[PDB]
Amino acid sequence: AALTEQNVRLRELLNSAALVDDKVLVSELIGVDPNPFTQRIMIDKGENDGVFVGQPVLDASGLMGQVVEVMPYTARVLLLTDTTHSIPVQVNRNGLRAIAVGTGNPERLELRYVADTADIKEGDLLVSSGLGQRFPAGYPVATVKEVIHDSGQPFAVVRAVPTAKMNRSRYVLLVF
Amino acid sequence: AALTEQNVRLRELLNSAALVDDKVLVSELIGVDPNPFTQRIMIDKGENDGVFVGQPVLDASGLMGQVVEVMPYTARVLLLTDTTHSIPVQVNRNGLRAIAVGTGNPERLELRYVADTADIKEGDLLVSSGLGQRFPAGYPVATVKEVIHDSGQPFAVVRAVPTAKMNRSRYVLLVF
Amino acid sequence: AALTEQNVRLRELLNSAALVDDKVLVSELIGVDPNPFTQRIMIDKGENDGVFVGQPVLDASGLMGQVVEVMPYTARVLLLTDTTHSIPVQVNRNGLRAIAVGTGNPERLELRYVADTADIKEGDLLVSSGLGQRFPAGYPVATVKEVIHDSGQPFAVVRAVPTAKMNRSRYVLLVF
Amino acid sequence: AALTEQNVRLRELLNSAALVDDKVLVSELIGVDPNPFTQRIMIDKGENDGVFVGQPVLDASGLMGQVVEVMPYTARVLLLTDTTHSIPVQVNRNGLRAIAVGTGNPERLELRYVADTADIKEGDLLVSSGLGQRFPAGYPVATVKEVIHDSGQPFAVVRAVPTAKMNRSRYVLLVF
């Protein structure tokens, strides 16, 4: 049951193993807090494996977050969906720039600084822009779920859904 | 023209000078970045005046933010509306607890962790809860502007309007 | 003819000699370029009189500009209406903040960074805010002449008329 | 997703790679401030690449600005839309001369010194004139969006829209 599931997930990772242009360490999600909102997880790679603080973490469908602390053989990763996390993004098709902030909900981000009149709609893909010099650019982050316009305010309300699996992830990739 | 305006504002501060239960230093807003979104300001009090990092800052109508760096005679204050700022709050009437995050818009906060079914509505007052042990409790923070409910997601979307003046403030109070 | 005119203007200056809260040097406008758009003038005070680069210059009705270069007994002053000049201001009544830029026209300024929905109207007085730490705050700068709203853009177009006389000024005051 | 987008943008640059008459360095936009009004950006070329202070910067559709400071491998570029920036221009068809100033809005310039009666209309193309000896002449700058005439004042109000992408740009060209 674990050997099947692990194989399926591993294959998916091999199919998306060409999405990177560098060396990536295949680490597994191991320590997780029981509460289903704890937007921070642990990985089965650490210092011995060359993992460092700040390192980006992704899966076969999206950027997941960043390492925020390292142990000899394990490490802690803050997910994009944490209220404390922000990532610069852009709408894939047109290059419209924004900041995606965590909401504390496992399945939602919110985009900041999107003009109320901006060309953005449900289903548009957001990808990393790299503009904070933390993440490689071009990797999928989320898809727009909703736009809410607001009378008198400069910026629209934009809710999005991460493309990575967050809570339902198995194995994770660390970028060098 | 400055003597009139300054007097009006000062009076308002004297009328709300009984809202505190301790000693408060009356400081003025002095250095501000030209850009009208820079959610961070400076004050005309500093180290010489006993101002410290972390100190809460408010006006006659709301909590404004916190000191984040000190100079001999001036200081820098991060406002609640900054994307990096979060404050624990509660709905005044019923005690429903939430986290108010800055949106980067001068006139808006967003509440996190509010159950989709929660008893919250447009016009409800949010006040500090003190639960992060950073702010005194009971001081006005914002009023709910909008609730948006979301199918399948645990938490509602709540937008609120700070009660303090943020960008349109003159003088500020520092709590000891 | 010059003794009458000079007396009238001097009196007006004596009536507005209580608008300052410090020592002010009464200097006259002396060297001016023939072209009626040259938004830069000279004054009959200089180094010998303690005039310095950066010093604010005003008349009985408004801030006029700043000294930009000093000579033994004369000095050059850049006016607010020069395209290269900007001054932080605020709407007197409500404290709405903005940047007033010179237009190159002797009788016009333009305000930057005023929300399209902002509470501003024809006849509102703008005064210095001091927020650039160059000018004393509270001194009259201009009155709003026109608001033009713009579909899709965040900021309104605001044209204003300086309260100082610019080209039709006689004598000028330098603030210490 | 980044490889597609980057290819499209690169092609567009190859199609407009004949607009220059000299050697141009293809640099990418890398460091950008989160705030969506910060009219200043960074490029992934610098001193090592022969980039210098003052150097003009453009894209496939317009002049973008100028380098204002150089680092070993990166550089900072001030955009035309910054309130501090001015560029001499001319109406393409008739040669009517003007100064285009930044407004602080990402999508707007304003023309100075345009006679109220001047032959200028919505949709006219403005191009660099070279007359400040900073920019090559003939390169597209903006298109007129609006003319507002003003009773008693010599100069019309002219708002224009840059042809370059400013905030929505990917890669940039530096002119030698």
At residue A101, φ and ψ (nearest 5 deg) are -105, 145
How far, CA to CA in Å, does D10 sit from each of A114, A166, D161? 26, 34, 23
**Chain C residues interacting with chain B (CB cutoff of 8 angstroms):** 86, 88, 92, 94-99, 112-113, 115, 125, 127, 129-133, 137-140
Nearest-CA distance from D22 to chain C in Å? 32
Q: Residue C82: which residues within 8 A CB-CB, separation 6 or more?
A: C39, C40, C65, C102, C104
Cβ neighbours of C52 (radius 10 Å): 12
Instruction: Measure the CA–CA gap between C124 and C141, rounded to whole angstroms.
Output: 11
Rg of chain D over Cα atoms, rounded to whole angstroms, equals 16
Write down the residue that tokens 């929905």 correspond to: C117
- The answer to whether D148 and D156 have CB atoms below 8 angstroms apart is yes
CB–CB of A154 and C152 under 8 A?
A: no
Cα–Cα dist D103/D115, whole Å: 20
Closest CA to D145 of C147, C155, C153: C153
DSSP lists the bridge partners of residue B41 as B32, B77
Q: Do A94 and D168 touch (CB under 8 A)?
A: yes
Question: Which residue type sits at B172?
Answer: V
Nearest CA-CA partner of B12 in B157, B136, B170: B170
Which residues share a beta bridge with D90?
Answer: D97, D127
Cα–Cα distance measured from residue D86 to residue D80, given in angstroms and rounded to the nearest whole number: 7
What does the block give as tokens for D1? Answer: 């997703």
Nearest CA to D137 out of D92, D93, D103, D168 is that of D92
Range of the structural domain that residue B132 is part of: 86-162
Residue in the structure block whose two tokens are 């410090």: C22
C-alpha C62/C-alpha C59 separation (Å) is: 5
d(CA A119, CA A94): 8
Q: How distant, in Å, are the alpha carbons of A96, A98, C113, D31 from that of A114?
A: 8, 6, 17, 19
Residue type, B39: Q
Chain D positions touching A137 (Cβ under 8 A) are: 2
What whole-number distance in Å separates Cα of residue B90 and Cα of residue A108? 23
Dihedral in degrees, nearest 10, Cα atoms C38, C42, C43, C49 = 140
Resolution reached, in Å?
A: 3.5
Residue B89 has phi, psi (to 5 degrees) of -135, 170
How far is D25 from D149, CA to CA, in rounded Å?
42
* Residue written as token pair 């709003």: C144
Spatial distance between the Cα atoms of A129 and D49, rounded to a whole number of angstroms: 23
- CB–CB of C120/C144 below 8 Å? yes
The partner residues of C92 in beta bridges, in order of sequence, read none
Which residues contact residue D166 at a Cβ distance below 8 angstroms, ignoring those fewer than 6 apart?
D39, D64, D79, D81, D106, D107
Residue type, C120: I
* List of chain D residues whose C-beta atoms are within 8 Å of the C-beta of residue B83: 34
* Residue D34 neighbours by CB distance under 10 Å: 18
Query: Quick check: C107 and D155 CB within 8 A?
Result: no
Burial C107-128 (b: 16+ CB within 10 A, else e): bbbbbbbbbbebebeeebbbbb
Report helix, strand or coil for B92.
Answer: coil
Cα B47 to Cα A1: distance, rounded to the nearest angstrom: 64
Whole-angstrom Cα distance, residue A85 to residue A112? 12
User: Which residue numbers of C have CB closer than 8 Å to A's CBs?
Assistant: 115, 117, 152, 154
**If you search the block for the tokens 């900007």, which residue do you land on?**
C86
How far, in whole angstroms, is CA C129 from its chain's centroid? 13
Q: Cα(C147)–Cα(D7) distance, rounded to whole angstroms?
A: 44
Helix ranges, chain D (H):
2-15
DSSP type of residue C1: -
Report how many helices (DSSP H) and strands (DSSP E) chain C contains, helices first.
Answer: 1, 12
Cα B105 from Cα B163, distance rounded (Å): 14
Up-side HSE of residue D113: CA atoms within 13 Å toward CB? 18
Q: Which of A79, A93, A96 is nearest to A165 (CA)?
A: A79
CA angle D4, D6, D12 (to 5 degrees): 105
| C vs D: CB pairs below 8 A | 43
List phi, psi (to 5°) of C162. -60, 150
C-alpha R_g of chain C? 16
Residue C48 near residue C150 (C-beta atoms within 8 A): no
Question: C29: part of which helix (H) or strand (E)?
Answer: strand C24-32
CA distance D161 to D81: 10
B79 interaction partners in chain D (CB closer than 8 Å): none
Asked whether the beta carbons of C119 and C96 are under 8 A apart, the reply is yes
- Closest by CA to B149, choosing from B105, B118, B125, is B118
b/e map D50-67, b = 16+ CB within 10 Å: ebeeebbbbbbbbbbbbb
What dihedral angle (degrees, nearest 10) is formed by the CA atoms of D20, D25, D27, D32? Answer: -70
Q: Which residues contact C83 (CB under 8 A, 6 or more apart)?
A: C39, C101, C102, C103, C104, D86, D99, D101, D112
φ/ψ of B96, rounded to 5, equals -60, 125
Question: Which residue of chain B has the CA closest to D82?
Answer: B35
SS3 D3: helix
Closest CA to C49 of C148, C143, C169, C173: C173
Is there a contact between C123 and C58 (Cβ–Cβ < 8 Å)? no
Residues 6+ positions from C48 with CB-CB distance below 8 Å: C72, C73
CA distance D70 to chain B (A): 24
Using CB atoms, which residue from A96, A99, A131 is nearest to D31? A131
Residue A155's closest chain C neighbor by CA? Answer: C154
Tell me if D15 sits within 8 A of D60, measured CB to CB.
Answer: yes
- Burial (CB count <10 Å: 0-12, 13-18, 19+), residue C145: middle
User: For residues B5 and B7, what is the distance between their CA atoms, to the nearest angstrom?
Assistant: 5
Say if CB A46 and CB A72 are below 8 A apart. yes
Contact assignment for D1 to A92 by CB distance below 8 Å? yes
Contact flag B169-C130 (C-beta cutoff 8 Å): no
Residue type at position B107: E
Chain A residues with at least one Cβ partner in B under 8 Å: 83-84, 86, 99, 101, 103-105, 107-108, 110, 112-113, 146, 148, 150, 153-155, 157, 159
How many whole angstroms separate alpha carbon A72 and alpha carbon A47? 5
How far is it, in rounded angstroms, from Cα A148 to Cα A132? 26
**CATH value at residue B143:** 2.40.10.350
Instruction: List Cβ neighbours of C162 (8 Å cut-off, separation of 6 or more).
Output: C62, C64, C80, C81, C107, C108, C109, C141, C142
> What is the C-alpha separation between D71 and C52, in angstroms, rounded?
35
Interface of D with A (CB under 8 A): 1-3, 5-6, 29-32, 34-36, 165, 167-170
* Residues of D within an 8 Å Cβ radius of B: 34-38, 83, 104
Contact C150, C126 (CB under 8 A): no
Segments of C55-132 assigned E as strands:
56-58, 63-70, 75-79, 86-91, 97-102, 109-112, 125-128
Neighboring chains of A (3 or more beta-carbon pairs < 8 A) = B, C, D
Residue found by looking up tokens 């399945």 in the block: A107
Give the rounded distance of the alpha carbon of C16 from its chain centre: 15
Identity of residue C82: D
Contact yes or no for C121/C136 (Cβ under 8 A) = no
Largest CA distance in chain C: 56
Longest CA–CA span in chain D (Å) reads 56
Three-class DSSP labels, chain A? CHHHHHHHHHHHHHHCCCCCCCCEEEEEEEEECCCCCCCEEEECCCHHHCCCCCCEEECCCCEEEEEEEECCCCEEEEECCCCCCEEEEEECCCCCEEEEEECCCCCCEEEECCECCCCCCCCCEEEECCCCCCCCCCCEEEEEEEEECCCCCCECEEEEEECCCHHHCCEEEEEC
CA C153: distance to chain centroid? 28
Q: Are D107 and D143 in contact (CB under 8 A)?
A: no
What letter represents residue B173's amino acid? L
A44 CB neighbour count, 10 Å cutoff: 16
B101 in helix, strand or coil?
A: strand
What are the two backbone dihedrals, phi and then psi, of residue A8, each rounded to the nearest 5 degrees? -55, -55
Buried b (16+ CB within 10 A) or exposed e, A91-105: bbeebbbbbbbbbbb
D50's tokens: 């022969």
Q: Say yes or no for a CB contact (<8 Å) between B104 and D35.
A: yes
Beta strands A40-43; D157-162: pairing state: unpaired
Among D37, D83, D89, the residue to mutate for chain C (most C Cβ within 10 A): D83
For CA atoms C125, C130, C134, C138, give the dihedral sign. Answer: positive
CA A146/CA A167 separation, integer angstroms: 22
Closest CA to B167 of B25, B34, B14, B55: B34
First to last CA, chain D: 32
Q: How far apart are CA C79 and CA C66, in angstroms?
A: 7
Binary contact (D37, B34; C-beta < 8 A): no
Planar angle of CA C119, C125, C127, nearest 5 degrees: 105
- Structure obtained using: cryo-EM
Structure tokens given for D93: 């068809």
